[PDB]
Design a protein around this nucleic acid. Structure first.
Ligand SMILES: [Mg+2]
Ligand SMILES: [Mg+2]
Ligand SMILES: [Mg+2]
Ligand SMILES: [Zn+2]
Lengths: 124, 122, 69, 100, 49, 55
RNA sequence: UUAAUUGGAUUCAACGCCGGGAACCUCACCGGGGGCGACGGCAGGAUGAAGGCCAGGCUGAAGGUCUUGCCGGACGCGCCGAG
């Protein structure tokens, strides 16, 4: 009942070069990685590696909704901005390859009320 | 530097050639005030006339120029009053050292007083 | 050819597979369930029964009865 | 040993005047000059909504600019080239001379 | 206030504790980190002893 | 440096990379044949440029 | 309905209309972070005003602020007018 992504365990994915991992991700993620990380994404990755190495034991918050989830981020907790607040996202192995913004909805679910004046032809 | 330092007397000719030889050279020259600025001027030799006034207490930022006097030629003179020093050259404040570099038509009396100070005490 | 099968690059094994009938249905159900377990935007759209591929929903996609004022 | 002269203008009369003067110069000397060939007119059409706001029936302007052209061939002879090179066309006329 | 001290000076001798940045000449003074020569304007990673 | 936080980013595409040369508006810019003029401004200066309404 | 779902137009003569096919920009809305007062004058200021920085904190990110200490020389939003 272990986890496997294309026939590979999580540990095998940990010791994989970035370029090698791009061949297993889908087309959009392969193109994005081939074009390089943005400088803000670079800063976030530096903080993530620092936290993994045993340093920086403070919550990690970010405005980077377009960051792709990588195998080295699994196990951490990251606070992703959704427009007005930073919401907590816990990285699970099955999240590998998705954008962070996919886990921080920006809109509230709609619960409708009673239609008002002007909502029908005979109500105007 | 400061009145509380007996170097020599207050010769009238020294004030005569240190004060009344810069108003006619202000309109034809450059001026660099400030002991922090001049410390570099004096060390690197940028300054041409070091006029050091006796108004700076304590002997903390004044105890740099007299020790550095014998390292370069530094034709140097002293100013009795500070209120009008900026009026003679600069602005309407109290100045500590107004360095003029290469002034126009300000040579004969300056050379004579510099020779007198060289033959006075160094 | 490998570009003609209905499940290229399988998520578990990584091979190029083709499925029919019950296995196909269970694989689709597993894909949707995996999306739902991680609480991805698409999984939430699947749960609420709303369009998942970016459509506008103000005018069309109406299934119900008229509300009165 | 032949020169190609290209002309363009927004005004038909001036264009005609310059071509006729070059023709007179080529007549005043023993030299063959292929007649002024008319190339197709260039038309610039721009269609715009008339109203500054968006209220009322939509109505449109169709603005047009027309640029006429001519082509002249002559054999490069200095006795004839000096006369044509010293002609001054009006400011609204472009003239270009090349040797082929 | 005033910041000009920590330069070792006696009655007639002058020598600076903080050296000048090699890209420029003397007179400009660095910081006193102890770990490295901050130098204020350019920067160096040399691990001053 | 404080003036850095007043300055605009120099874009090369999008609506923000083109302004009317007469009034400064963004938006409905006529790009035909190198003109850079709003639809509003082109209507009132078209006769001065040599355009005519034949039909 | 929402933190906000920016605003105009309602018979013909409002509703693929505002040349309105908005990912950034556009933008006017919402959450958050910074910056700006020619000219007259007040406290002030070379015994140096205002302004500018290597490194590491705070931070979404920032000499924005801070800590560590360097820089440069003449105007001056801590104040009232005024723009
Ligand atoms: Mg609306
Ligand atoms: Mg679009
Ligand atoms: Mg926008
Ligand atoms: Zn315009």
């Amino acid at each position: 009942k272990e986890f496997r992504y294309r026939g590979y365990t999580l540990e095998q994915l940990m010791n994989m070069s970035l370029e090698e991992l791009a061949k297993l991700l889908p087309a959009r993620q392969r193109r994005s990685l081939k074009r390089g990380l943005t400088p803000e994404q670079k800063k976030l990755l530096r903080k993530i590696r620092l936290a993994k190495k045993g340093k920086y034991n403070k919550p990690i918050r970010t405005h980077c909704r377009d960051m792709i989830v990588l195998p080295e981020m699994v196990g951490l907790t990251i606070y992703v901005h959704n427009g007005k607040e930073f919401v907590p996202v816990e990285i699970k192995p099955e999240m590998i390859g998705h954008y962070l913004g996919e886990f921080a909805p920006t809109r509230k679910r709609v619960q409708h009320g009673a239609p008002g004046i002007g909502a029908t032809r005979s109500s105007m | 530097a400061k009145p509380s330092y007996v170097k020599f007397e207050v010769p009238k000719e020294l004030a005569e050639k240190a004060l009344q030889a810069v108003e006619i050279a202000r309109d034809t020259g450059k001026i660099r005030k400030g002991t922090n600025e001049t410390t570099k001027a004096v060390e690197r030799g940028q300054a041409k006339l070091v006029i050091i006034a006796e108004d700076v207490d304590p002997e903390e930022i004044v105890a740099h120029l007299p020790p550095l006097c014998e390292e370069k030629e530094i034709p140097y003179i002293y100013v009795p009053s500070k209120k009008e020093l900026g009026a003679a050259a600069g602005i309407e404040v109290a100045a500590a050292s107004v360095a003029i570099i290469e002034p126009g038509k300000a040579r004969d009396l300056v050379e004579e007083i510099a020779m007198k100070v060289r033959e006075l005490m160094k | 050819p490998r570009w003609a099968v209905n499940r290229p690059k399988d998520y578990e094994t990584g091979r190029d597979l083709h499925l029919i009938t019950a296995k196909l249905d269970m694989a689709i159900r597993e894909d949707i369930m995996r999306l739902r377990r991680i609480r991805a935007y698409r999984g939430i759209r699947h749960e609420l029964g709303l369009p998942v591929r970016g459509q506008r929903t103000r005018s069309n996609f109406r299934r119900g009865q008229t509300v009165g004022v | 040993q032949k020169a190609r002269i290209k002309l363009a203008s927004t005004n038909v009369r001036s264009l005609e005047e310059v071509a006729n003067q070059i023709k007179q110069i080529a007549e005043r000397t023993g030299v063959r000059m292929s007649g002024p060939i008319p190339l197709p007119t260039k038309r610039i059409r721009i269609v715009t909504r008339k109203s500054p706001d968006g209220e009322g029936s939509a109505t449109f302007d169709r603005w047009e600019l027309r640029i006429h052209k001519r082509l002249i061939d002559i054999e490069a002879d200095e006795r004839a080239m000096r006369q044509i090179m010293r002609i001054r066309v009006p400011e609204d006329v472009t003239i270009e001379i090349e040797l082929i | 206030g005033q910041k000009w001290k920590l330069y070792i000076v006696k009655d007639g001798k002058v020598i600076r504790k903080n050296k000048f940045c090699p890209r420029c000449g003397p007179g400009v003074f660095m910081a006193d980190h102890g770990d490295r020569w901050a130098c204020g304007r350019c920067g160096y990673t040399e691990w001053k002893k | 440096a404080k003036a850095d936080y007043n300055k605009r980013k120099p874009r090369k595409f999008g609506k923000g990379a083109r302004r009317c040369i007469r009034c400064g508006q963004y938006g409905p810019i006529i790009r035909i044949h190198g003109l850079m003029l709003c639809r509003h401004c082109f209507r009132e200066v078209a006769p001065k440029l040599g355009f005519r309404k034949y039909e």
